[PDB]
Swiss-Prot record:
Record pathway: Steroid metabolism; cholesterol degradation; Lipid metabolism; C21-steroid hormone metabolism
Protein EC: 1.14.14.25
Subcellular locations according to the entry: Endoplasmic reticulum membrane; Microsome membrane; Postsynapse; Presynapse
Annotated catalysed reactions: cholesterol + reduced [NADPH--hemoprotein reductase] + O2 = (24S)-hydroxycholesterol + oxidized [NADPH--hemoprotein reductase] + H2O + H(+); cholestanol + reduced [NADPH--hemoprotein reductase] + O2 = (24S)-hydroxycholestanol + oxidized [NADPH--hemoprotein reductase] + H2O + H(+); 7-dehydrocholesterol + reduced [NADPH--hemoprotein reductase] + O2 = cholesta-5,7-dien-3beta,24S-diol + oxidized [NADPH--hemoprotein reductase] + H2O + H(+); 7-dehydrocholesterol + reduced [NADPH--hemoprotein reductase] + O2 = cholesta-5,7-dien-3beta,25-diol + oxidized [NADPH--hemoprotein reductase] + H2O + H(+)
Cofactor names: heme
GO molecular function ontology, one term from the record: heme binding
GO biological process: bile acid biosynthetic process; cholesterol catabolic process; nervous system development; progesterone metabolic process; protein localization to membrane raft; regulation of long-term synaptic potentiation; sterol metabolic process; xenobiotic metabolic process
Main location: endoplasmic reticulum
Gene3D superfamilies linked: Cytochrome P450 (1.10.630.10)
Organism, scientific name: Homo sapiens
Pfam families, per the entry: p450
This protein's name: Cholesterol 24-hydroxylase
Keyword Chaperone: no
Residues engaged in binding heme: C382
Length: 436
């Protein structure tokens, strides 16, 4: 009854219900998420106010679902789910060093190598008949890239290795959203314990390598270890291991899958993308850093994919004191939900919101002002945004260079929600090599 005055109700996901409600009830709406009343805020004025300030911090009660799942510590107090500013700021600044310009440029080989491996696997299946799950294939590529890039490990999922790990990740992701029977609880808990134990194993290996005096290239793991340099235990270290292990591939994978799915019904845009890749990189097997900037139309297409299909759909901030938010009195101690998914699909912010038009992001176009934030905004924006943007460009360019994709009829364009948003179907495609 402290929220009853707030406007709201008395392959389709919860985020679409939020969209319906935002359109019907306005820019500040009372909802239910994780059994706590929150308020969904969809004006750009409020996006700017709350996301662009260090006065407003993440709401720990909303992130509890990431911290622990059915009594098993998952993301814990790692970089995403830490809600105390000062503890967050300490780890952010140390881990930042692994995402410097020069750190990222040195990852171009890993990106090219895994992309080339994926494409060679796909080319062998390109008979215009064999159904290929592009969701699965892109997920394996994202994982292999992340494992190598962040941790110096070879998962070899593209070779069919690590099935138990891919199961662990899948069951864990389902559990996050499920917590919003007996056998599900057992499977979820064991999967989370498995992921942390992988963490312990890889950490010990890294420590052993350093002890024996072997070469260890400075990576995300190096800075994560640095962030914990005199902690009383390894729990903080394991929290970040799991956080980056998951966050570092899941959404890149989803983003790739959504893009391939959408592009399957956009032959004109595909022909333009094929033409750009042919002109910028020709037959080069390897994309250089400077080539990435020249794939301008591809950049625009990936931005438009994220407008309609943001895998990371939202973020929460704690409103501490009663505040007037677009003409609505919102009580203190209230979680505010900001959703780039909802805003992206509102005709108030985007003309013909359901039309896929890369020209929205053209060099002369008016830039969206606080209506588009697939990597969020402000101090809690995605640390891996540029890592992600580079990796998906490399993967997309290499697919476009070499293969034609047709979505198998019956495959749907609808969404599912498992912490993140992702294609409902496995994006089954048949493939042909480019050039007949
Ligand atoms: C297209 C791919 C990606 C998308 C769409 C994305 C999106 C986001 C969003 C929306 C947030 C804010 C989360 C929140 O407020 O709760 C975030 C934060 C974060 N992301 Fe990503 N991300 C992507 C890729 C990555 C990658 C590749 C990494 C690591 C290699 C990563 C690691 C993180 C971390 C550690 C945070 C917390 C940052 C902080 O609070 O300081 N993400 N990301
Ligand atoms: O922490 C994650 C995450 C969860 C699972 C896999 N990956 C990532 C992730 C990938 C890339 N960058 C950051 C993080 N996300 C993505 C989910 C939401 O945006 C909202 C959300 C908040 C609370 C509970 C569920 C959902 C939040 C932040």
């Amino acid at each position: 009854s402290r929220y009853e005055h707030i406007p709201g109700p008395p392959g389709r996901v919860l985020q679409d219900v939020f969209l319906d409600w935002a359109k019907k009830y306005g820019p500040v709406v009372r909802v239910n998420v994780f059994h706590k009343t929150s308020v969904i805020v969809t004006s750009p004025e409020s996006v700017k106010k709350f996301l662009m300030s260090t006065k407003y911090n993440k709401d720990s009660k909303m992130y509890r679902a990431l911290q622990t799942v059915f009594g098993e510590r998952l993301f814990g107090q790692g970089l995403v789910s830490e809600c105390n500013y000062e503890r967050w700021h300490k780890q952010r600044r140390v881990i930042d060093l692994a995402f410097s310009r020069s750190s990222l440029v040195s990852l171009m080989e890993t990106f090219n190598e895994k992309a080339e491996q994926l494409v060679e696997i796909l080319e062998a299946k390109a008979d215009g008949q064999t159904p290929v799950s592009m969701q699965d294939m892109l997920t394996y590529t994202a994982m292999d890239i992340l494992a190598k890039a962040a941790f110096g490990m070879e998962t070899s999922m593209l070779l069919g290795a690590q099935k138990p790990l891919s199961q662990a990740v899948k069951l864990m992701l389902e559990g996050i959203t499920a917590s919003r029977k007996r056998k599900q609880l057992r499977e979820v808990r064991e999967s989370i314990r498995f992921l942390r134990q992988v963490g312990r194993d890889w950490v010990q290996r890294r420590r052993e390598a350093l002890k024996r005096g072997e070469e260890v290239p400075a990576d995300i793991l190096t800075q994560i270890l640095k962030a914990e340099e005199g902690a009383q235990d390894d729990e903080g270290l394991l929290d970040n291991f799991v956080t980056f292990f998951i966050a570092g591939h899941e959404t890149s994978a989803n983003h790739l899958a959504f893009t391939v799915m959408e592009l399957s019904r956009q032959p004109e845009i595909v022909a333009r993308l094929q033409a750009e890749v042919d002109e910028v990189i020709g037959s080069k097997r390897y994309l250089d850093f400077e080539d990435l900037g020249r794939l301008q139309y591809l950049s625009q297409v990936l931005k438009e994919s994220l407008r309609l299909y943001p895998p990371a759909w939202g973020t929460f901030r704690l409103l501490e004191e009663e505040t007037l938010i677009d003409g609505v009195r919102v009580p203190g101690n209230t979680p505010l939900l900001f959703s780039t998914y909802v805003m992206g699909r509102m005709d108030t912010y985007f003309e013909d919101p359901l039309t896929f038009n890369p020209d929205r992001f053209g060099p002369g176009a008016p830039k969206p002002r606080f209506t588009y934030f697939p990597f969020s905004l402000g101090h809690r924006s995605c640390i891996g945004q540029q890592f992600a943007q580079m990796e998906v460009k490399v993967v997309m360019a290499k697919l476009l260079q070499r293969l034609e994709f047709r979505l198998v009829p019956g495959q749907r364009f609808g969404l599912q929600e498992q912490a993140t948003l992702k294609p409902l179907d496995p994006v089954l495609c048949t493939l042909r090599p480019r050039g007949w």
